Amino acid sequence: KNIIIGAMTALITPFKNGKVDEQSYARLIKRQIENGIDAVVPVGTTGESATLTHEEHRTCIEIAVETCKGTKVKVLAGAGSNATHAAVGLAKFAKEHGADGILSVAPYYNKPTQQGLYEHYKAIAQSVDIPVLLYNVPGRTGCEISTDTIIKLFRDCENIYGVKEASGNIDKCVDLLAHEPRMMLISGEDAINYPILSNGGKGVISVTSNLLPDMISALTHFALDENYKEAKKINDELYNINKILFCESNPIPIKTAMYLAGLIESLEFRLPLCSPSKENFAKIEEVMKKYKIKGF
Amino acid sequence: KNIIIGAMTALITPFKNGKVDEQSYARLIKRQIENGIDAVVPVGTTGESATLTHEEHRTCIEIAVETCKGTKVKVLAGAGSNATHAAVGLAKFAKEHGADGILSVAPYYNKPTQQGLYEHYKAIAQSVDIPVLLYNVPGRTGCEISTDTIIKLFRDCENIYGVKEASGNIDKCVDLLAHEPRMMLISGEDAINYPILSNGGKGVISVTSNLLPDMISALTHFALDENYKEAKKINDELYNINKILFCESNPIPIKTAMYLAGLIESLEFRLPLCSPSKENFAKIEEVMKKYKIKGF
Numbered sequence: 392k393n394i395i396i397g398a399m400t401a402l403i404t405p406f407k408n409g410k411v412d413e414q415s416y417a418r419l420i421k422r423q424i425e426n427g428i429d430a431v432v433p434v435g436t437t438g439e440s441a442t443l444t445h446e447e448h449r450t451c452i453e454i455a456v457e458t459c460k461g462t463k464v465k466v467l468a469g470a471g472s473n474a475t476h477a478a479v480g481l482a483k484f485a486k487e488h489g490a491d492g493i494l495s496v497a498p499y500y501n502k503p504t505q506q507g508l509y510e511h512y513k514a515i516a517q518s519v520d521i522p523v524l525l526y527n528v529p530g531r532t533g534c535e536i537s538t539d540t541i542i543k544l545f546r547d548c549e550n551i552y553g554v555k556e557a558s559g560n561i562d563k564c565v566d567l568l569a570h571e572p573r574m575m576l577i578s579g580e581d582a583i584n585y586p587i588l589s590n591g592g593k594g595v596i597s598v599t600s601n602l603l604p605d606m607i608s609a610l611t612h613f614a615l616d617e618n619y620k621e622a623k624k625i626n627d628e629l630y631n632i633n634k635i636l637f638c639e640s641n642p643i644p645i646k647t648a649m650y651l652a653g654l655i656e657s658l659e660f661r662l663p664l665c666s667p668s669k670e671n672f673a674k675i676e677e678v679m680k681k682y683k684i685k686g687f
Numbered sequence: 688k689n690i691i692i693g694a695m696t697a698l699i700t701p702f703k704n705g706k707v708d709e710q711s712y713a714r715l716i717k718r719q720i721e722n723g724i725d726a727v728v729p730v731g732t733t734g735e736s737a738t739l740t741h742e743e744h745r746t747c748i749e750i751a752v753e754t755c756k757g758t759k760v761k762v763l764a765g766a767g768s769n770a771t772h773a774a775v776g777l778a779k780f781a782k783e784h785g786a787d788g789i790l791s792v793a794p795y796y797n798k799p800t801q802q803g804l805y806e807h808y809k810a811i812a813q814s815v816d817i818p819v820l821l822y823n824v825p826g827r828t829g830c831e832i833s834t835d836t837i838i839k840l841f842r843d844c845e846n847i848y849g850v851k852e853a854s855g856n857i858d859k860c861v862d863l864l865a866h867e868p869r870m871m872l873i874s875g876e877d878a879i880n881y882p883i884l885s886n887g888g889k890g891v892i893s894v895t896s897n898l899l900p901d902m903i904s905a906l907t908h909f910a911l912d913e914n915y916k917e918a919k920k921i922n923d924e925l926y927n928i929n930k931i932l933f934c935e936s937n938p939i940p941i942k943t944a945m946y947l948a949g950l951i952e953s954l955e956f957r958l959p960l961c962s963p964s965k966e967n968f969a970k971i972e973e974v975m976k977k978y979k980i981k982g983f
């Protein structure tokens with residue numbers, strides 16, 4: 392099975408005057424490359440996929456594919472939908488633009504059954520020849536890919552190599568790797584990056600790595616090299632920023648931190664996303680002061 | 688304030704050989720009109736909004752608008768999105784195609800803050816001159832429009848005339864109508880249609896009315912006439928069908944029931960939606976035997 396693992400970054404999408412800042416986008420990806428990141432996730436949830444046009448979806452994948460050309464860094468493009476015909480199209484679309492693999496969110500809002508989730512991902516997997524990573528975030532989608540469904544998809548479809556978990560359920564990550572230890576469990580929650588890695592997870596798709604890519608990649612590589620003491624040290628160290636980056640819904644705090652760190656020009660979102668409250672703005676700025684934020 | 692209230696139906700969208708069955712669609716709406724329904728809700732969640740193309744979105748709104756010409760029945764079109772610019776576009780689209788009002792579900796998946804929900808709905812309301820009904824379904828969207836946000840939108844925006852609550856929270860239904868008794872609380876959960884109406888709710892947007900429109904229409908009008916004894920009697924009789932119509936995710940059971948009743952020709956969904964399990968198929972078929980299903 393072809394896999395994409397290690398320290399991965401859910402790229403924010405900087406906007407300037409209602410348009411994608413294409414020069415900040417490429418500049419941020421080369422900052423990710425230069426801080427040990429193994430793969431970048433363009434136009435995911437942290438990249439405000441939902442409010443991007445499908446042309447802008449193309450632009451940020453092409454920028455990500457080009458900026459990581461000639462490097463070891465892979466591009467795991469966000470290509471998910473709650474409509475299977477659309478998800479299949481987004482998967483073929485990401486392949487035809489150079490992405491090394493796709494992250495495919497569980498169908499949101501329409502709450503498909505487990506049988507439907509299987510057929511949903513089966514159609515996606517059969518439409519591409521690139522790796523497919525499932526994304527389970529039940530707090531956002533309103534549905535859950537069960538352990539049995541994840542394992543059945545991993546064994547029955549050849550492109551599906553694992554799942555990114557954002558469920559706050561370390562029990563399920565024991566459930567997953569105890570019954571199917573060959574899959575690539577990916578941490579989708581920065582606060583519990585080390586516990587997921589120490590149980591056999593093989594990477595993270597991180598929000599905090601937008602601001603502190605060196606620390607998240609160091610954390611991941613420590614754990615993969617079985618230096619659990621140094622991996623846990625970084626994880627404990629980042630708990631404060633890992634939690635404050637979710638004081639409001641992602642990616643509102645991380646974009647605030649990127650702006651406060653002077654890494655993006657504008658604290659600009661696309662509605663229904665907006666700037667944080669003045670109190671959370673201050674709290675985010677206060678937690679940052681404890682970290683050394685790498686520049687360009 | 689211009690309002691759209693009473694017994695309303697969240698229309699299923701019949702499929703025949705992978706296409707929208709346009710002649711069954713109109714015939715089902717005329718069955719709703721003929722059984723006392725006050726408004727129809729095309730291309731909502733029960734209509735599998737997520738898996739329909741924009742042209743099919745256009746086709747089913749136009750069919751609903753045309754079928755209710757010459758009747759008192761209004762058209763409350765589904766026109767919501769987790770992108771405000773898309774929701775504004777869908778709202779203008781529904782108005783320019785004859786819809787009497789729009790149902791706009793809260794942004795699904797990206798979890799906007801309350802401030803973001805306010806600006807999201809303010810932009811939708813200011814783009815049209817037809818009534819706007821909020822839709823709060825947190826189990827599907829991953830976010831909830833709080834009582835304060837619902838009340839502020841009702842008072843600051845003119846087209847916003849109420850909310851369709853599907854949250855299993857009768858406390859919130861007291862909270863809403865006690866602090867702003869002029870808003871139109873609409874029940875989005877069939878099992879608790881009467882309790883919501885008996886506290887001052889002015890209508891329902893029902894799933895069960897697809898199968899039993901006469902019973903749902905009698906319930907609402909009994910309650911609106913303060914005949915709570917006859918309204919509660921119908922609500923109590925409908926509890927069994929109200930619950931079994933959600934044994935799997937809506938609209939999987941209701942489309943199965945419509946098919947079992949011989950009202951649609953094919954039990955066809957669009958992925959990731961699928962047919963129910965053989966056991967739930969039997970349970971739906973068994974509960975239906977206790978009810979009188981009107982024909983054409």
Ligand SMILES: [Mg+2]
Pocket residue numbers: 889
């Ligand atoms: Mg009235």
Ligand SMILES: [Mg+2]
Pocket residue numbers: 912
């Ligand atoms: Mg009367």
